[PDB]
Amino acid sequence: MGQLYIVPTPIGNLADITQRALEVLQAVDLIAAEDTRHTGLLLQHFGINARLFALHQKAETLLAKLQEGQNIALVSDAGTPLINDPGYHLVRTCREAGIRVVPLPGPCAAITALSAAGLPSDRFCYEGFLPAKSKGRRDALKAIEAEPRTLIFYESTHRLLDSLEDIVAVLGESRYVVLARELTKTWETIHGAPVGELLAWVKEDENRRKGEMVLIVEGHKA
Amino acid sequence: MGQLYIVPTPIGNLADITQRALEVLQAVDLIAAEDTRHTGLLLQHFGINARLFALHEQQKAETLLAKLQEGQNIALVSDAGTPLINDPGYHLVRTCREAGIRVVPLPGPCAAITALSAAGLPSDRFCYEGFLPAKSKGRRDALKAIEAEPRTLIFYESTHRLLDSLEDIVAVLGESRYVVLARELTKTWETIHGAPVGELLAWVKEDENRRKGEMVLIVEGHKAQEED
Ligand SMILES: C[S@@+](CC[C@H](N)C(=O)[O-])C[C@H]1O[C@@H](n2cnc3c(N)ncnc32)[C@H](O)[C@@H]1O
Ligand SMILES: C[S@@+](CC[C@H](N)C(=O)[O-])C[C@H]1O[C@@H](n2cnc3c(N)ncnc32)[C@H](O)[C@@H]1O
Structure with missing residues (x-):
């Protein structure tokens, strides 16, 4: 059974990254992003190659992969996801399906x-x-x-x-x-x-x- | 004139500190801490040898304000998470803000x-x-x-x-x-x-x-x- 990681990102300064964030992003099977291009820039800066999945429901698609045993990191453009940023539907879906949600500060x-x-x-x-x-x-x-x-x-x-x-x-x-x-x-x-x-x-x-x-x-x- | 840095610390996992927090904690003249022994333990995990100041008083806020004015940079930390969020520092920030001292918050x-x-x-x-x-x-x-x-x-x-x-x-x-x-x-x-x-x-x-x-x-x- 896969897990969902909520991963906050910098809000304008790339030194505002944490070591656990870099390790999770590099370890998960898939990264669901608000904009795949902003996140690609970010990932390339840290030398992380990862599969991106655009988050324009789609919750049900990502849900199935998690039940297949895939680990997913949710990121937004900047800052913490779900704080005026997408992901509220996915976490709802995952939680009632009994998927563990792991938030990174x-x-x-x-x-x-x-x-x-x-x-x-x-x-x-x-x-x-x-x-x-x-x-x-x-x-x-x-x-x-x-x-x-x-x-x-x-x-x-x-x-x-x-x-x-x-x-x-x-x-x-x-x-x-x-x-x-x-x-x-x-x-x-x-x-x-x-x-x-x-x-x-x-x-x-x-x-x-x-x-x-x-x-x-x-x-x-x- | 020096600056006051607001520096969040982990809430139970040492890999959650930001890289910029580590940079700042090593560069400032003084770390003002809610609890200098608790903070000492965190710094110890990162090899950091720093000058600690106990906040245990607008009196101590006046002390820190004086240092800042003579050009010293200060970081403020709490035992865990973000300072001022149910953690001390509120009065210090206020005092510094009304004296022209720049406050620099780290996320x-x-x-x-x-x-x-x-x-x-x-x-x-x-x-x-x-x-x-x-x-x-x-x-x-x-x-x-x-x-x-x-x-x-x-x-x-x-x-x-x-x-x-x-x-x-x-x-x-x-x-x-x-x-x-x-x-x-x-x-x-x-x-x-x-x-x-x-x-x-x-x-x-x-x-x-x-x-x-x-x-x-x-x-x-x-x-x-x-x-x-
Ligand atoms: C859609 S929100 C994203 C919020 C973000 N998820 C967070 O963690 O706060 C973007 C808004 O957040 C605020 N914001 C984001 N970055 C900021 C920064 N570096 N300085 C000031 N405000 C910022 C701005 O009001 C901006 O319009
Ligand atoms: C006085 S507060 C400090 C808040 C801190 N300044 C912050 O920004 O999160 C301490 C309280 O925050 C909550 N807290 C701190 N760390 C936590 C953790 N790892 N898990 C759950 N709750 C936590 C607990 O309620 C704890 O008693």
């Missing part, structure tokens, strides 16, 4: 940003992406506006300015927010301020919203 | 996330709740405050309180709420078992081994019910 952008924010982390909520539509986004924000826990959002560069102005609008312009940009890359920048002043600070320079970002929002006073 | 092991990735529950959104109160009365109140939460919930629980805690979860959340018990992740006794919580509680009681070691609880969020 590794990089996760949300936790990485939270560890550097200087905000209360005894409790937090992970919200993923805000809605793209301005109305739907203001409604998600009103929905959590009272939440006392630290909130973590993933946000896109094109939508940051609009998201931030809505946040000012709904949560108020003195709500402390930490913007974590391009974690573990050369450009890495983490800056926190009252969200009013943060929005002002971001607009001063266009580059301050370039690349991948996480927002850490302080929770309501309570 | 790495975190038990909550590791468990979540393999639990088979919705992770589109989730709540990290940490440790439930140790006393049953306190614990039941904390559970009542989140009974209606629709997001997947994550809890840390101790081996000595798991059976009591599971009894209170049955009682407050109901015996059918799906819960996953992730035990001894990355260790040789690793076991991830999910079930309606009343069944989970019974399953655990069959064999005392099933509650030994370190554990995460992944709890299915609340679904709407007519009985209300």
Whole structure:
């Protein structure tokens, strides 16, 4: 009976790899990836030759191979699979079929940003992406506006300015927010301020919203 | 001016440390640790000879801030997993941030996330709740405050309180709420078992081994019910 390995990958820095990750990737019969080409680049950097299987169900196909006794590693493009990344259907399928699922610890952008924010982390909520539509986004924000826990959002560069102005609008312009940009890359920048002043600070320079970002929002006073 | 590095460490398997963590732990002037003896043992496995600083005080945060300002680089670690995630360091990071000191987080092991990735529950959104109160009365109140939460919930629980805690979860959340018990992740006794919580509680009681070691609880969020 085969096993499924969940294997987190770097989020922009290739030294953020672990030895057990490299050993699992090289040992499994098959690697199910989000994008076979991103992962191929990654594998070639570490001198690992492996069979890739694209993850565009397909769960049932991979399930059969596991029952045939094949070991499978699930990876995503960056970070930890199933955290706003594919694989939720496969793990469900495998688990009720009695397939052992083995998670490797590794990089996760949300936790990485939270560890550097200087905000209360005894409790937090992970919200993923805000809605793209301005109305739907203001409604998600009103929905959590009272939440006392630290909130973590993933946000896109094109939508940051609009998201931030809505946040000012709904949560108020003195709500402390930490913007974590391009974690573990050369450009890495983490800056926190009252969200009013943060929005002002971001607009001063266009580059301050370039690349991948996480927002850490302080929770309501309570 | 020096920088403050936030450095995750293994949660039971030495091959889970990142290569960059090893690089940083060997390059900084000082390692500030939750427990210098526990950290000493980890460093020893990797041949690393380092200067350790005990965090056991905004007083000590002021000490470290001073070193950073005179140009010293500092790494912060906890006994396991990611610092600040139910581990000290929060005030130090804050103090450094408001003084212009750059904080550099390294990604790495975190038990909550590791468990979540393999639990088979919705992770589109989730709540990290940490440790439930140790006393049953306190614990039941904390559970009542989140009974209606629709997001997947994550809890840390101790081996000595798991059976009591599971009894209170049955009682407050109901015996059918799906819960996953992730035990001894990355260790040789690793076991991830999910079930309606009343069944989970019974399953655990069959064999005392099933509650030994370190554990995460992944709890299915609340679904709407007519009985209300
Ligand atoms: C679809 S998600 C993948 C999340 C990933 N699986 C993880 O482990 O967090 C991609 C989003 O994560 C966040 N992210 C990923 N890498 C990042 C980095 N290096 N710095 C800041 N945010 C990052 C960004 O918000 C980006 O839009
Ligand atoms: C105070 S916390 C430290 C959390 C750590 N900072 C992290 O990022 O995961 C310790 C608790 O985390 C959970 N934990 C740590 N290691 C674990 C493992 N290998 N398997 C299951 N749970 C673990 C247990 O509930 C343990 O009592």
